[PDB]
Every structure is written in C-alpha cells, then in structure tokens.
Ligand binder design. Structure first.
Ligand SMILES: [Co+2]
Ligand SMILES: [Mg+2]
Ligand SMILES: [Mg+2]
Lengths: 208, 207
C-alpha cells in the first residue's frame, strides 16, 4: 500500500554520520548522508532522494586523534568542500518535510546502523544550529543492526550486506554517503523480503 | 538450530527498566527485570530464566517528581523490598554469564523496547556499582520497537503486542517485570514467525 500505512505514519529516512569522536555533545560532526525512501504502487520500498555533506566542525568542537586516524578525515583540508552543520541539516530537513507531506506521513524516523549513535549526533547538531521544527522523532529509530540480526543473523553492516547478496567495498566504509546507500539498500531489502515471503501485509499469510 | 548460531553468537537477554527520570547519568534506577531466552531442538525461541528487582536509588541520585507521578513508584516505601544496584545487576550478570557459556555464545545483547533507554540506564548502574566483566555488549542492542515496526507495522509496545495477538494489560504497563515478559514474548513471536514463514534459516526459502 502506501508508505504512510507501513510504519504507522513514520517517514523512514536513512542517515549516516562520520565524526571526530564518540561523544555527540563534545565531538565534531564531519560527514552526514541522507536517503529518503518511497513505495511504488505495489507497496515495494526503495531509495528516493539522496543528500550528502562534508561538515565543518562547530566552534568549540573537540577532535579525537584516534577518530580522525580511523575514518581518515582531515577537517583542516581546504578542498573538503565542507559546509556548516546548519546548512547540511537545513537542506536535509527541507527534503524530509517535503517527503513527509507528499507521502501523507506524520513525521520522520531515522534509519541507521546502530542508530542511536547517528541519532545522537544529528540531533545534537540540529540543536547547535538552532534548527526549528525538527521533523525527526526525538528518540525513536529503526536500527538496522537489530533488523539485520533478525532478517540475516548478522549485526555488522558489511557482513549483513554480504549475507544479503549485496556488494560491500571496505575501501569506502569510512564514507557517510557510501554507508548510507548500502544501509538504505539493506533496509529496503529486509522490508521487501518480508513482504515477498508473505509477512506483510498481515492478512497475506492467510489469503492463500 | 542453536541459539549461538542465530545472532552470530549474541546472547539475547530481554530487559526492562523503571526510572526516576530520563537521564541515565543522574536519575535513579528503580526497577529492572531480565529474561534470558533459549532455543529448543528445532530452533524455536522461548523465555528461559526470569529475574526482577525493585532497586534502591543510588546515593546522590535525582528523582523527578514527574517520573514518580507517572510510574507510581514511591522509593521511600519500606515495603517495596528494594535491593542495591549491585545486588540486582550482579545477580543478572551471574545468570546471563551462565546462559552465555551453556549456549556456546560469546556475548550478551540487550533486547528492549526503545532499547537505548534501558541500555543506558543498565550500563550506568553497572558502572556506579563497579561491576566487573559486564557480559552485555557496550553499544549493540535489539530494539523491539524497530523489529515490531518491521514485523507488525507497529512501534508502540502495547499496540505491537495486540497486533501480534497478545494480551496487554495497561494496568501493569508501569511494571518492569510485566513489560519485560510481554516484550520477551513479542521478540520470540517475531523471531519465530520469521522462521515459520521461511525467512530463517537463509537456506529454507530454496528448499
Ligand atoms: Co575530501
Ligand atoms: Mg555509521
Ligand atoms: Mg520500558
């Protein structure tokens, strides 16, 4: 049916984040990717709009060396094409509000791998940027680590995609955009496979 | 069909908490329940061991009157048979570790509704109590809100249970033990139906 019927009004948005640490309050946000979803007329789920940004560290932001050493990001590189947290989120929020309205959903829910990590950073940044009318649910998320745990028996993203028959280039694992895309395809695959096997809608199982 | 094979070695333990606020760092833990799971020979999932505790507020803990008014808990009632965070968690960890070894798993993962909330409160209590060798994964969880969203198109615990054909008594919604048992049955129902519809194991579909 309609996307608005699938998750009780929740407009699922796949989000990934790269950072300069583990602490959403103190550490900088360096990258964020966003992929909205849409359902065709037969009720199949698929990626809709894709956004991605290199993000400037907020003034007073801490930068953990090990974080940089891990994700390989150097915030001081002038060729980053980085934008402010406000600019990135404002563009993502705009697209999301559009989708919510167009789809007849009541609000957005973040889809992410170990979602709380990405949720905490995005929400913190939005707060720093004084963003109004944050379309996202304040604490609800769709953790694909848990979903993949159920659907595929794997909780690590790369193994989940592999087990799902998807490609995964560890070469791009530190890229917010790449992770977001793989996670969007993964999530869509998990949901669609549920419908395919007659798990959805709930009346399908008996109508045979 | 082994539990240790179902979630790449993760030992799913259902957990629910009742609190005196929204902040895990500052607010008191008041209730905690724990339900380990087990798989039969055919690989069906079901509740195993059940634990439940009323918890003493750690000394120096804040207590939001809004929270107390909501959950109906009176931490000052001497008849609530409370125990320290150490007592409670130490007992759960003991039971959990035994389950992990007996099932051949390697680590425990918390199963909770909006799991981050309970995870953060349990982990914070564990730190306050200086518990050693916490068997739970430090950030991974199985949020039943998201799983029910997938399996049942519902994210609210009560509505998710109803949609799944389970009973839900609002009268008991403020009890950690009750929420934990309902959530455990929900999680099992979700895992079991995925298997029964041919979703698991992965090879089943082509058989
Ligand atoms: Co660059
Ligand atoms: Mg990530
Ligand atoms: Mg709860």
């Amino acid at each position: 049916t309609g996307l608005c019927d699938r998750f009780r009004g929740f407009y699922p948005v796949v989000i990934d984040v790269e950072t300069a640490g583990f602490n959403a309050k103190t550490d900088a946000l360096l990258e964020i990717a966003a992929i909205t979803l849409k359902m065709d007329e037969q009720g199949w789920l698929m990626p809709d709009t894709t956004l991605h940004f290199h993000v400037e560290p907020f003034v007073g932001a801490n930068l953990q060396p090990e974080a940089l050493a891990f994700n390989g990001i150097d915030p001081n590189d002038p060729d980053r094409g980085a934008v402010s947290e406000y600019e990135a989120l404002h563009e993502i929020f705009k697209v999301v509000r559009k989708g919510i309205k167009a789809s007849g959903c009541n609000r957005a829910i973040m889809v992410a791998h170990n979602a709380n990590f990405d949720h905490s950073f995005m929400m913190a940044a939005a707060e720093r940027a004084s963003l109004k009318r944050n379309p996202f649910h304040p604490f609800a998320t769709f953790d694909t680590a848990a979903l993949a745990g159920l659907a595929l028996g794997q909780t690590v993203l790369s193994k989940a995609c592999q087990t799902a028959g998807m490609d995964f280039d560890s070469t791009q694992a530190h890229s917010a955009l790449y992770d977001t895309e793989r996670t969007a395809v993964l999530f869509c695959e998990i949901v669609n496979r549920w419908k395919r096997l007659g798990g959805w809608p709930l009346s399908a199982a008996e109508e045979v």
